[PDB]
């Protein structure tokens, strides 16, 4: 183990907090206690989210050296260009944004979806938006690298973040410490977690959750949800971005696979389902909290969908992870029609 | 220590932590240190906010006695609404809306203005939305005191909270204990605050902020930033406010005045300004952080008017609270256009 040997810089209030949801349990029959790691309430940097939790241990990299833009990349709402453009302002630097289609851009939706959300947020922080309809791949691209080599051409010196740093050396390691939060919080709070569930598609987060907590031989407690539909390539860079990372914080337990339910995908990347959207009532009409129908959404039925099936014991606890994701919601705001009288 | 008499509802994570925006101030000419007290960051409730705070001690005569439904009225893009939504989820109860129209809806953003943040959040959280064409007022509304009655009506108990909750007999309190936090916060971080920036509309945050400070013969270091567009009834209600909470908590002083600067208002109450605009993309850019065209943008664009003006002691340690708002943002895209590099 070794999470202490990389360098960090801050980039959030600290320890993320954990939710109760209590009242959403009652809900769902009392079977399972709900729990909620909220990530989705990092930092003051535009909203907060996951991809923060990641940056921490690249930012040094970037400061370190004498770099002048960060580039990214990712779908329409992407949720994390905008907190890659946050990370620039902050490290005052220029930023470069690649925005492909990720997401067949629903009719009632057409207009507002690429304008309004998180891409707006983007802008606002003054970034380099760019957008360009490419389809969607949890993969590198080819056009990430020609921006890069656009910038290298005008003298300046590009700074590499592939879609969700998935692909990043050091994506990995921000989880880890993920892991470490936890089994320090069940000691503050007095609840041991037997299972934690968390959104997946390009690896990262979850990868790292399972180095994280394979230090302590709990992989097992993991629980992915798949939502980028293409659960082949997902499984399989979930699971290899999860070896990686081993190496590096110096963790020898090797990975073969890890709990992916993957019955909650469909359609494809971005459009939700009929159960997707009940379940972001229910936890919302329930809890408060807000999810979307691009992440956080479809894991948060799939916890439910779970909890009906008794696929835990009676007085279980269990930790969701809100991956945040909300400010996209603006760009869905057809699916939710006003509550029926 | 008047505020602990009154029984608290934790609504919020614990105290609201503090941004040192040192790169904003670097960027105003190392004129001053700005400092923002995030409230934008106190709750996982649906982005957080500042109503939360207020509410958190409010809601604990939700439960004693029995209310049926959660009343509450603002504008289209009303925040205090799109947060007694979640607190009405969480509280288990009913929640009926009154929109009324408080801004002139941009051509541009009228197609959409009626339907993102703020407003398709508070559905989501199965929320009754009621639309009403009636106009801007801090003051006690007709549609709502109709509503509490319509429901009454339809056999029911509802539960009164009107405008930002400062018509609300605790309205106050929430704020007096943000006060509390600051003194605190000063000690933890080895510096005190000279001033305190923020905006001001229904007058509760400010009335509670001034009573609070007033503990400790500080409620002067308070700067109120309008932005209703209407001195007297906000003034003359803020004031009102700030006495009644000074009893409550037992506070002797009485306010006479404030210092309620109404530069930025302009145009209008919902509508920005290039100085708006221009505050939001200044410090977004500086440092991720995100302000609305209605109340964070226009208290910002103050907080810089004021720092150019050399309006404060030099070196001096001004604290710029963050109330939140950001998530209307998306019904305003359209003042914040792709910037060039
Ligand atoms: C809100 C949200 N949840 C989950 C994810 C999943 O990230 P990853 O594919 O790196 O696990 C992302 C990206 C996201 O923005
Ligand atoms: C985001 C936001 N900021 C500021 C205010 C103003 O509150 P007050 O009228 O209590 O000063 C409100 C209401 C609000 O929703």
New interface residues.
Partial sequence: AGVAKFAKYPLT?GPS?I?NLN?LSQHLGSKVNVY?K?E??N??????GNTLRKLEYIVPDIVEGDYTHLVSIGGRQSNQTRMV??????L?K?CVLIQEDWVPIPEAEK??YN???NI??S???????RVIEDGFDIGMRKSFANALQELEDAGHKPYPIPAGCSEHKYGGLGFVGFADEVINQEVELGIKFDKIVVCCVTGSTTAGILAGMAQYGRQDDVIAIDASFTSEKTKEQTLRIANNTAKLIGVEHEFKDFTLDTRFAYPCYGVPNEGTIEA??TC???????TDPVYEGKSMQGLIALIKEDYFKPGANVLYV?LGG??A???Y?SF????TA
Same sequence: chains 1, 2.
Avoid: W, Y
Wanted: charged share 25%.
């Fill in positions: 209030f907090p939710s009242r909620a909220r989705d309430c930092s003051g940097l535009a909203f907060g453009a946050a990370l620039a302002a902050k005052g220029k207009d507002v304008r309004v959300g707006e947020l802008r606002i922080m003054g970034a380099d938006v972001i009532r919302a009409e329930q809890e408060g909290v807000l809100h909300a400010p919601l603006s760009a705001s939710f029609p006003t509550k």
